[PDB]
Amino acid sequence: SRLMQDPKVQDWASIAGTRRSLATNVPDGGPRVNVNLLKYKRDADFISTTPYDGGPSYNAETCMQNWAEDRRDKHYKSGFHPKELRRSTRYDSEYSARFKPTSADYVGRLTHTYNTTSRFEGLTRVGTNGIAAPVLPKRSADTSGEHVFYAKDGYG
Amino acid sequence: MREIVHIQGGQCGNQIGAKFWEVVSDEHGIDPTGTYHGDSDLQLERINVYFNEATGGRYVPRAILMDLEPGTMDSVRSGPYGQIFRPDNFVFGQTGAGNNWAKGHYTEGAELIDSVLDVVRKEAESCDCLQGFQVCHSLGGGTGSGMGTLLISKIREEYPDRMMLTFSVVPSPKVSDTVVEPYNATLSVHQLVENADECMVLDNEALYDICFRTLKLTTPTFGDLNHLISAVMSGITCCLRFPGQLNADLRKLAVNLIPFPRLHFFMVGFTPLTSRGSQQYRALTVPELTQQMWDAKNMMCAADPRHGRYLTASALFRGRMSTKEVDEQMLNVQNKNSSYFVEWIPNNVKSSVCDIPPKGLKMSATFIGNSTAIQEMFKRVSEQFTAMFRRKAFLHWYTGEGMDEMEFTEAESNMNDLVSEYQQYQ
Amino acid sequence: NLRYCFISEWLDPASGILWKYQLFYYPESKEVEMVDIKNRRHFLKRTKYEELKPSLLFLGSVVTVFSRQLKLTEYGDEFTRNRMESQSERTLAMIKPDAYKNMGKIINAICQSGFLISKLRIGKLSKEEAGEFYAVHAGKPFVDRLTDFMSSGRVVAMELVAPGAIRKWRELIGPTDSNQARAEAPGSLRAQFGTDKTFNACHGSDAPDTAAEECNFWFGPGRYPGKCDLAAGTTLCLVKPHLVADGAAGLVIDLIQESFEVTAGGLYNLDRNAAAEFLEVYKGVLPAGDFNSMVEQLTSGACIALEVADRDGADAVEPFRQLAGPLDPELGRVLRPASLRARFGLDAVRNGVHCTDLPEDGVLEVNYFFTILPTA
Amino acid sequence: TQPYTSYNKQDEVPTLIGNWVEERELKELTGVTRNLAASQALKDSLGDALTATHPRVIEHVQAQTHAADWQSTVQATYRPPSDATRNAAAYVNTS
Amino acid sequence: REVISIHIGQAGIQVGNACWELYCLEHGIQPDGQMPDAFNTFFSETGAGKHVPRCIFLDLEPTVVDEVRTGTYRQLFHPEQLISGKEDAANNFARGHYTIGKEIVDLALDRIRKLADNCTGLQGFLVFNAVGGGTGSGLGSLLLERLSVDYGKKSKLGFTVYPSPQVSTAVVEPYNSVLSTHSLLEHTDVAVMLDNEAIYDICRRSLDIERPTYTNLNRLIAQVISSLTASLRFDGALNVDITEFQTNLVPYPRIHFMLSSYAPIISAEKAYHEQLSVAEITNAAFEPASMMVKCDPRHGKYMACCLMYRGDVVPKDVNASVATIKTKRTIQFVDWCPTGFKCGINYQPPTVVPGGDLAKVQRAVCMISNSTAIGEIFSRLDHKFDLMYAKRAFVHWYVGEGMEEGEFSEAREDLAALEKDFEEVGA
Amino acid sequence: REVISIHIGQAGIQVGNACWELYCLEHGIQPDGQMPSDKTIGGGDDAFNTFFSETGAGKHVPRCIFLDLEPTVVDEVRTGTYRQLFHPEQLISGKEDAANNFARGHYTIGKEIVDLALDRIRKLADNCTGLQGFLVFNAVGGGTGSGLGSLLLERLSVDYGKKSKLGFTVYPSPQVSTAVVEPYNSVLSTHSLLEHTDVAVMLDNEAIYDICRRSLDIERPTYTNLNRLIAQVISSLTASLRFDGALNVDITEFQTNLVPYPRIHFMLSSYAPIISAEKAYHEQLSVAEITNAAFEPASMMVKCDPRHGKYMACCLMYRGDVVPKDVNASVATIKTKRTIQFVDWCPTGFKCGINYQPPTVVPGGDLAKVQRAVCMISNSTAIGEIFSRLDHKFDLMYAKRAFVHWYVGEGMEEGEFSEAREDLAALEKDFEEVGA
Ligand SMILES: Nc1nc2c(ncn2[C@@H]2O[C@H](COP(=O)(O)OP(=O)(O)OP(=O)(O)O)[C@@H](O)[C@H]2O)c(=O)[nH]1
Ligand SMILES: Nc1nc2c(ncn2[C@@H]2O[C@H](COP(=O)(O)OP(=O)(O)OP(=O)(O)O)[C@@H](O)[C@H]2O)c(=O)[nH]1
Ligand SMILES: Nc1nc2c(ncn2[C@@H]2O[C@H](COP(=O)(O)OP(=O)(O)O)[C@@H](O)[C@H]2O)c(=O)[nH]1
Ligand SMILES: [Mg+2]
Ligand SMILES: [Mg+2]
């Protein structure tokens, strides 16, 4: 019943028959056991937006690796509100503070659209940290979104 | 399933067997009254190998007892675990041989071997799938060596396909019990090279020095030596009785250790062996078992392995273990002292693991070395045999019984041929 | 050199793996430490946290050290076991409908006198289960009338755990007579809020077994007796783990009962998943970080749920929300000092209480807390 | 090499000549030092064959594994999947 | 589509006991037999609410078999589908091939025939065994022969357990391995080696378990098998079947021996550590420190490789990684064959076992290549067979069972011929 | 990081009997060898691993061997309170004493006992993994601790060589002395103690007598009290390995920071605050005063005058509640003071060290529980005065060939006497040269 309270039992149902030894006690370790096998080199051109090498990619929140074409995609949700509608001190870029939408009417149009559709369009995909998980394609034919005939819906 | 029929000959065989059935009864958790009183269900599944259910859980052993003087039978039944042997397995003469190979092999054998053959047959067809026979006896005595060897010949004639292990003690010069030890040793080993499958040589001096050094007992009576030999026997047969990671039966050990049909005299060891006062120093890990296992002072025979070359070796491990550490330890002990192993065989060491340690232990091992240093022991006997035969000492008590001189010449020639072959492969 | 060693498991949300950590608390240095059972490696050097309260562990709670909500599942050492089991003693301390009108005062008296309310419920029993309770006195006509009286009002049934709990509690009760205790020791509760020998208010238990079966009846493995609930016009109020830890629950229950009538109540831990689902209204409403902090604060320990009603019977959400004051604890304090979030609300995520803000969802939230949470 | 035991003839090891240390350890464990015959002879016909001989030859009080702990490796490694609770860290079901 | 698996020997059924644990866990089958259509390739549905595997365990010692019969999976296995002889073959090819085989294999194939008849869309057979022993090598080869004469055209994927060069458990495994391979050549269609030293080095290096037993080996071998069967079991973007190994990896009917690899071999703490991506695991599947057979492909030239992918795999990335591999000059391909890759993708990620040391990975790669380092392996075993045979060691055991020295000499010259073939191909 | 300790002689194993008592109560180990069943040892607690190896489950055997020829003190240990701590195969014991005879202990009985010592220390080092070094305990005045102690050091140096050997020796005091030929034994020990050990710390007896007389105000001490505070010094110097500090040092540091020349390795030790239970309540013990207290000769472990010498280097262990600001301020004040002076050619002469765990008390002991403590290990030329003092009384007895016939009766000659005498003379010249 007391599996972790007393060690001899720990030995008893350890598979090997003995419990893991202390770090200092183990004869071989450290620099030898390093799993550096999962290593690669990313060849990056001076202005390449996205990597074709096949290395891992940063999230769309981070501004790198073809972030622009992604931020500007239709099935992409950001856990935080856009800069144009933000309101406080604390993390105002100098440019952002001085350059704000001049016309209150324009702000009104902006806020109507944003609130009705994009603010709560998706919320399940939002994780605990607030960083939306990328939609993961399932099935051979699954298409993320329309790319060729882009103007599927017109006039709004 | 696979069935081991135990045979005990003479005084040494009867007392060793008495301790052996004590240990086996211990490890299967049966009380000396004959009923099961263990707790784990790992034990009820493999008692058919060593016992038979009679009625009401009365598990009686499948053993045959053989001697010629009622002193040994009384010592069998006077001790605990005495009244579990079947009264019909007390097959037993009345006159006594007394250190005479001729008496034990031609006169007393003539009217005792038929009745014990009736008993061994009955106890053989009583079970279904024989694994083989396991016999424990001596070589110096008369009623053990001669009678037992005649039985070995008779059973290897009738059942030629079953395995056969012989645990036989051999004489020693500094500890020499009887006077005609060479006259009995030579004739018995001459018959064992032709009939027994594999012989695991024991001796008293090596056991004696073991209780000196490793156990640090003050007075090692026979009960201690008998328990050590019995511990080795259980360590051998552990594979059939308990599940393991790599099971290794008796035939599996014979093919991994016998490269040539006459080349089958092993030496044995057992680990761990530490004193009562030092049970706490040691941890139970593979290196600490192995440094003791390959120690020359842990051999149960008086043949220094450092004075020859190992041909093959085998290790039977018991207890939950890590096979990686088991094998890398075997590889290290094979590579470090590489000169002591034969050259034309790679991987001299067979290993095996079973998951149940002997009761009172955590992790044990049993070593069986088929070395070439055993010719030292046989030369130790042959020079004494030639010294006696040179002037026909004590010969007439053999000649007057039917035996002639060419028997002695045949025994000496064969033993000399055998030690020549060991010297060849060294 | 003192250790209190517990076994406490933590499941990282990211890997979804639950491992057991050995958690040592040194009460002399107000210091904490923990090691990993599986890999036999240190997890904390032996850092001095002193954030935690040596009253807050008690083998049940969730301790928070470096943003790891880890709950203590088992007693690590026999020495710790003995020392703690010597402290923890089970008692039932239900109140009677007479002083129910001032339960918060009584509960504040309890928490200040030194106790731990491990379980709490508020319900009114019908006569059948009323007779189920007090069953061992089925023959007495005195008790045969008590088993009817007790089923009239709204009864608080609450457990208490403390060293010498039975003794200390039965003492603070005072003898079955109210008036002679008023004459002897007015500080005793039954003397402070007692009418007659039959209209006492501060019932408790007297023997360990006769407390075991009574707590089993009230709390039980899966029992929910005499549920008292209202349909509409009544709002919710969540007394957060902060105030139940610092015992201030007594200071707020009476503070709200003076103006409103509590209808139901209960103290029950709640899971992250369950806690997060309950605040779904606030996901798109608040920034992600602050909503996360709120949900984890709500799942950071025990919490009390008062089902606040109104006197007139018109509506509760509007007046009670003003009673709570501004959501910010600090902003409310400067211009709304009468609100309770200003009175004992600590900080932004550590505010005092939680109150529903849309009159549409009052019934939704209360019926969630009082039907769907217990039956799941 | 050779033990020297001319003292402590009686079933007690007061003096420290010879190998008193393992003799003393054995005395606490079985109550009989050297041969079981000597103790009976002092206590006082019968011989000395009847000896316990387990705790003298092979036994390790600390590392003894009770038959309750006897389990084959396959049993100890293929636990029922649904309720396995012999491991510290396991991926918990998290619907 | 259905596939049946047979397990021979002490190693065969212990690996199978890990493999069928993984299958039950992957399709969510309780160990008593019922769920709380993709399973149809392994578990048949009997009656209502009951699944019974398409497998046979067989051995000549009844110990480990009825050890399974009293294990955790008692109701799951068919009582009859566990064949058990009464006595061992004891590291003896002739004993395992002529004495007991003649009475065990008839019942075995009379059982596998009605397994196949209850099946409908049989893909082929898939056999696990070890050649170093007597039970697995002897009647494993005998059953392989008699399955070939019965069905033949059905492929037979063989996952064998060879002896490692220095780490070794027996003595006569040279003889048993040699006499096994003479039939492993002409009857197995695709043979995959599974050493023991290489996996020990993997378990001590990657998963850093310092005292590894056979179970850990059996668990990650099960991972490999389930990874290369995942294509038939689940739907993926680019599915491959059992007939593909036959075609895309066997350029000549006598060269079918594969080096295997699996990535990522990562414990529960290093998954948090490392950012698993397709490029580095495709790289990591090629270093010798991640192959399941102890040999160095730097000494040889690849002929053809196959790569199963499980989990979140986008084809642009796998194509890019293998492009960087082809342009990398550390490893070299043979020119006889220019386009020597084959990919395959399945959607589901590999599962974990409670108590396993492998963490829940997002994506995994199983590489099955062909090379000439295998030709180096057979020579390394050939030399130590010659050392022993020159002195006529251990021969009397086999001859006593009934064989001669002719089968020794012809199996020796057979392996010599195969040595000449790998030398000619590698050119 | 592990270090093992060998105890050679009557004095050594009595010091060890006090030292290992201190260690087990520092780690909360009951004398039977295992922790109290009530509390549970931390799963990943390797603090005790540096000395104690955990064999199996719930047992800790020290990494040390007591060895001597006379069996009286050894089997006293075997029957004492710590029977269960050392089980009896490490406690090596001879059959007859060397009896204050260096030749008899280095040639006659050493040849029988040293091989057993070596092949036991071999398997102890084989159980060991990250061996830092050895540390030996002996009093060079006697015969056993001197003679075979020198032989054991010689064969250890030829076995490992590169590993450091901390030699805590006990030199004979000038006026207080219980032996007669200990001058002879001391010169013959030094002839090998020079070229074998790397770091050798002197502990005199009269100095410790004066410490317990003055500070601990014990008018009459026995050897129990002396060995008790010696154990305090050893434990204070190894606490940097056993317990994590803010600024820790290992065994190899004294090898570098303290030994400027490969022959000048003799370190005066001292300790503070050596204070009783009453002086403690009355007097506050902060860092500045204990740093001062560590430098007067009234608290040193060797009866010598550091004012007559110039410091080559110093090292300061601080245990307990010590922040680095005020140890920094204190060594600043010491460096600016002119009552003591460092040797001119080395400007930086300090080696500070801070450890968190304070020193503990022993039950029945006389030292009270202090919040902090200081162990000073220095190097000066006063030792060069000490060796001359021993050299004088060696030459006085050698001038009449007194007691020489015992050594020659054992098998030695006059050559080793003359060469040891000139060896100490060359040693004297080297201290006088370096001090300039
Ligand atoms: N990797 C791995 N190898 C195993 C396992 N079990 C057995 N083996 C290998 O099998 C080889 C010996 O053959 P065994 O399986 O033990 O026995 P066998 O093949 O059935 O032949 P017999 O002993 O005659 O019954 C050993 O060298 C092991 O390497 C296992 O569970 N995992
Ligand atoms: N510090 C300390 N020194 C001691 C103690 N006992 C003896 N000594 C010193 O040891 C010196 C003599 O050597 P001993 O230790 O008594 O005996 P030995 O070194 O074993 O040499 P033998 O007597 O020949 O065996 C004396 O000058 C004492 O100063 C002790 O308990 N503590
Ligand atoms: N170890 C051991 N050896 C024994 C025992 N009984 C006899 N022997 C040995 O057997 C040899 C004599 O055997 P013996 O009794 O004459 O055989 P038998 O007369 O034919 O039965 C002697 O060298 C003894 O050392 C025993 O119980 N234990
Ligand atoms: Mg097998
Ligand atoms: Mg002395």
GROMACS .gro file of C-alpha atoms in nm, chain C residues 8-12 15-20, chain D residues 87-92:
model
   17
  590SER     CA    1   0.185   1.564  -0.273
  591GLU     CA    2   0.113   1.517  -0.641
  592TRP     CA    3   0.124   1.778  -0.919
  593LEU     CA    4   0.008   1.730  -1.282
  594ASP     CA    5   0.163   1.977  -1.529
  597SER     CA    6   0.243   1.736  -2.026
  598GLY     CA    7  -0.065   1.604  -1.839
  599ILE     CA    8   0.161   1.381  -1.620
  600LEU     CA    9   0.088   1.339  -1.246
  601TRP     CA   10   0.399   1.278  -1.030
  602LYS     CA   11   0.439   1.261  -0.653
 1045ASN     CA   12   0.445   0.380  -1.057
 1046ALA     CA   13   0.508   0.741  -0.940
 1047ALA     CA   14   0.444   0.922  -1.271
 1048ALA     CA   15   0.186   0.800  -1.525
 1049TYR     CA   16  -0.008   1.003  -1.781
 1050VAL     CA   17  -0.338   1.062  -1.594
   0.00000   0.00000   0.00000
